[PDB]
Amino acid sequence: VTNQLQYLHKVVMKALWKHQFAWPFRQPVDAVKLGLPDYHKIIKQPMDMGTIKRRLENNYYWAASECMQDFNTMFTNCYIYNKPTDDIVLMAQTLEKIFLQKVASMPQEEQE
Amino acid sequence: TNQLQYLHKVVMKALWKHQFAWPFRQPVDAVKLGLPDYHKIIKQPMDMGTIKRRLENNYYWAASECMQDFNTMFTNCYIYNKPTDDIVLMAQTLEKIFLQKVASMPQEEQ
Numbered sequence A: 001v002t003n004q005l006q007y008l009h010k011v012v013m014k015a016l017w018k019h020q021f022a023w024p025f026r027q028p029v030d031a032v033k034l035g036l037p038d039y040h041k042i043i044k045q046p047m048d049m050g051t052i053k054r055r056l057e058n059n060y061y062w063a064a065s066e067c068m069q070d071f072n073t074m075f076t077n078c079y080i081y082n083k084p085t086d087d088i089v090l091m092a093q094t095l096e097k098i099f100l101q102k103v104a105s106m107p108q109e110e111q112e
Numbered sequence B: 001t002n003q004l005q006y007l008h009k010v011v012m013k014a015l016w017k018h019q020f021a022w023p024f025r026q027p028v029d030a031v032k033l034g035l036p037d038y039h040k041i042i043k044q045p046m047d048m049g050t051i052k053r054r055l056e057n058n059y060y061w062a063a064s065e066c067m068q069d070f071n072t073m074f075t076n077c078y079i080y081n082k083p084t085d086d087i088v089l090m091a092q093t094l095e096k097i098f099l100q101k102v103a104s105m106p107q108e109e110q
């Protein structure tokens, strides 16, 4: 497995998964459960930490950059769809700041 | 530091020249662009011109802190604009390059 995907699993996902703001992102947006009949109109590429976490457990990723894009798509989905004033937006912002400051310490290069 | 230099000369380099970069090279001008609610909604304006100047003037103490400014700039765009505005596509494209360039950053400190 890659040095960088190992960092993404054990440092980034470990931090973000147990975070007190993580729960709205731990599973796919369920448009029916949440009452969002336009969600899949607006968000064409849904993403969530459950999917990323399993994808790290199943070595589905080839490069770290593609794990990073899933994280980024997840947060971007949230800012695009939700209202500027929704608490979910500031939860995503808080989680994204951690993702970014962890990524600033990720190795370079590749392995495996 | 080595990482700030990389963010200056590799990351900011690539993004500045990009064909979608022009809305992001200078602060949003809410009055010229016709957006009287822009500052009611975005409380932390940010833009690559401000980030470039801060890197030239040694404003940043750490890499993560310049990376946060890049993120704020993109997030502002996503939060303020309608999902279908082209500028959202432009920010996503730029942000993807940003993440990919950041993954190859020297891991140290300097």
Ligand SMILES: Nc1nc2c(ncn2COCCO)c(=O)[nH]1
Pocket (backbone or CB within 6 Å): A018, A019, A020, A023
């Ligand atoms: N579904 C749901 N779970 C929550 C809420 N607050 C905390 N949790 C549990 O997740 C926190 C991590 O254990 C909440 O408001 N709703």
Ligand SMILES: Nc1nc2c(ncn2COCCO)c(=O)[nH]1
Pocket (backbone or CB within 6 Å): A023, A024, A025, A028, A029, A030, A034, A043, A077, A078, A079, A081, A082, A088
């Ligand atoms: N109430 C609540 N909002 C959520 C949840 N998951 C997603 N959202 C709404 O944000 C969608 C952004 O892509 C969740 O389980 N709790």
